[PDB]
Amino acid sequence: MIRDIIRMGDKRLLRVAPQVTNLGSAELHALVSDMFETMGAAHGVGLAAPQIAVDLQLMVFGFERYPEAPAVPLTALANAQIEPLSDEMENGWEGCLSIPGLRAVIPRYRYIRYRGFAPDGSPIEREAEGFHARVVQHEYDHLVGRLYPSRIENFDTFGFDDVLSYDL
Amino acid sequence: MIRDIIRMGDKRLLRVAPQVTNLGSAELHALVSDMFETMGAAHGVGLAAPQIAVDLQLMVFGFERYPEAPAVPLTALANAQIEPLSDEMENGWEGCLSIPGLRAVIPRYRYIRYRGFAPDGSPIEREAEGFHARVVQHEYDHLVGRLYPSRIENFDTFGFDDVLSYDL
Numbered sequence: 001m002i003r004d005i006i007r008m009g010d011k012r013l014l015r016v017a018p019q020v021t022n023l024g025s026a027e028l029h030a031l032v033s034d035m036f037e038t039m040g041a042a043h044g045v046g047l048a049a050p051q052i053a054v055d056l057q058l059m060v061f062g063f064e065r066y067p068e069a070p071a072v073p074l075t076a077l078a079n080a081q082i083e084p085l086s087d088e089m090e091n092g093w094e095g096c097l098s099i100p101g102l103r104a105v106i107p108r109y110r111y112i113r114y115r116g117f118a119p120d121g122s123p124i125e126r127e128a129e130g131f132h133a134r135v136v137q138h139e140y141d142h143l144v145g146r147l148y149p150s151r152i153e154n155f156d157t158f159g160f161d162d163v164l165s166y167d168l
Numbered sequence: 169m170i171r172d173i174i175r176m177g178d179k180r181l182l183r184v185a186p187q188v189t190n191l192g193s194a195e196l197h198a199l200v201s202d203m204f205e206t207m208g209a210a211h212g213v214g215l216a217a218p219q220i221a222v223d224l225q226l227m228v229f230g231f232e233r234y235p236e237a238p239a240v241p242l243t244a245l246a247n248a249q250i251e252p253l254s255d256e257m258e259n260g261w262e263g264c265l266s267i268p269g270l271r272a273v274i275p276r277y278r279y280i281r282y283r284g285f286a287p288d289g290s291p292i293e294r295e296a297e298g299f300h301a302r303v304v305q306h307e308y309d310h311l312v313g314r315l316y317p318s319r320i321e322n323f324d325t326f327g328f329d330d331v332l333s334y335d336l
C-alpha cells in the first residue's frame with residue numbers, strides 16, 4: 001500500500017521518534033513493505049518512517065534520479081545508530097521526497113559505521129562510505145527531527161532541480 | 169508585459185546588481201511597468217529586478233496573500249540604500265516569488281530608513297517600520313545576491329505554505 005509522504009512544515013517531521021519494539025512481527029513487515037513501495041513509487045533512494053507520519057526509528061533505502069551514484073543494497077533498518085569512522089567531511093547533492101523540486105550541496109561524514117536490526121530481528125552492522133553513508137545519515141536525521149536545509153553551508157547551491165547549474 | 173520570474177538556483181539571483189543610471193527615461197518607465205504588472209499577476213508584495221533576470225538596483229513593492237498585513241504604498245525604488253534606525257529585530261513570515269510554495273519565519277530590523285530614487289528621478293527617503301520595513305529589506309537582499317533561506321534561524325518554521333502550522 002503506497003502511503004502519502006508528508007511535506008516539510010508538517011510538525012510530524014520535527015519529532016524525536018521512539019524505537020521499534022516489534023521486530024519480527026507481521027505489523028512491522030507490512031509497514032516495511034508499504035515503505036519500500038512508497039519509496040519506489042516516488043523514485044526515492046531512502047525513506048524514513050516519519051515521512052509517512054509513522055513515529056518510529058525505521059528507514060528503508062537502496063537501489064541499483066541520482067544518475068551518477070553507485071549501487072546501494074536495498075535495506076530496511078530499525079533502531080539505527082551511527083558513528084563516524086573518520087572526521088573527513090564530503091560535500092554532495094541531496095534532495096528529499098518531503099521537500100519536492102529542490103536540492104542543495106550538504107556536508108556529511110565520508111565514512112561511517114551504522115548498526116540496528118532488519119525487520120526480522122537479525123542484527124545489521126556495516127561500514128559505509130560516500131553515497132551509501134550519505135543516504136543513511138540523511139535518513140537518520142529524520143528520526144531525530146532534522147531536515148537537510150539546516151545543514152546547508154553554501155546557500156548558493158540551494159535551488160530548484162531544473163534550474164540549478166552550480167558545478168560541484 | 170508580464171516577465172518570467174526566475175527561480176532559486178538560477179545564478180542570476182546571486183549577483184551584486186549595478187546601479188540604475190537611466191532615471192527619467194522611457195526604457196526605465198517601461199521596465200518599471202513590466203515589474204508592477206509581473207508583481208501583480210503573481211500576487212507579489214515586492215519584486216526585485218534580478219527576479220526577472222534584470223541586473224539593476226531596482227525593486228517595486230506595496231499593495232492595499234499576506235492577509236493579516238497593513239497597507240504599504242505602491243513604490244518603485246532605484247538605487248536603494250538602507251540604514252537600521254534601531255537594533256531591535258522582529259521575527260515574521262516571509263515567502264518569495266522565486267521560491268514558490270514555501271515560507272519561513274525570518275528576523276529583520278523593526279525600524280529602518282531607506283533612500284533612492286523614483287523612476288522619474290525624484291529622491292525618495294522614508295522611515296519604515298514592521299511589515300513595510302521587512303518588504304524593503306527582503307527586496308534589497310536580492311540586489312546583493314541574497315535569498316531568505318540563508319537568514320533562517322529556526323528551521324522548524326521553514327515549510328510549505330499549505331502544510332505549515334507553526335504558530336508565531
Ligand SMILES: O=C(O)c1cc2sccc2[nH]1
Pocket residue numbers: 044045046047066093094095096097098134135138139
Ligand atoms: O531521502 C531522500 O530523499 C534522499 C537522501 C538522499 S542522499 C542524496 C539524495 C538523497 N535523497
Ligand SMILES: O=C(O)c1cc2sccc2[nH]1
Pocket residue numbers: 212213214215234261262263264265266302303306307
Ligand atoms: O518579495 C517577496 O515575494 C516577499 C517579500 C516579503 S515580506 C513577507 C512576505 C514577502 N514576500
Ligand code: NA
Pocket residue numbers: 014015144145146324
Ligand atoms: Na526539530
Ligand code: NA
Pocket residue numbers: 156182183312313314
Ligand atoms: Na551570493
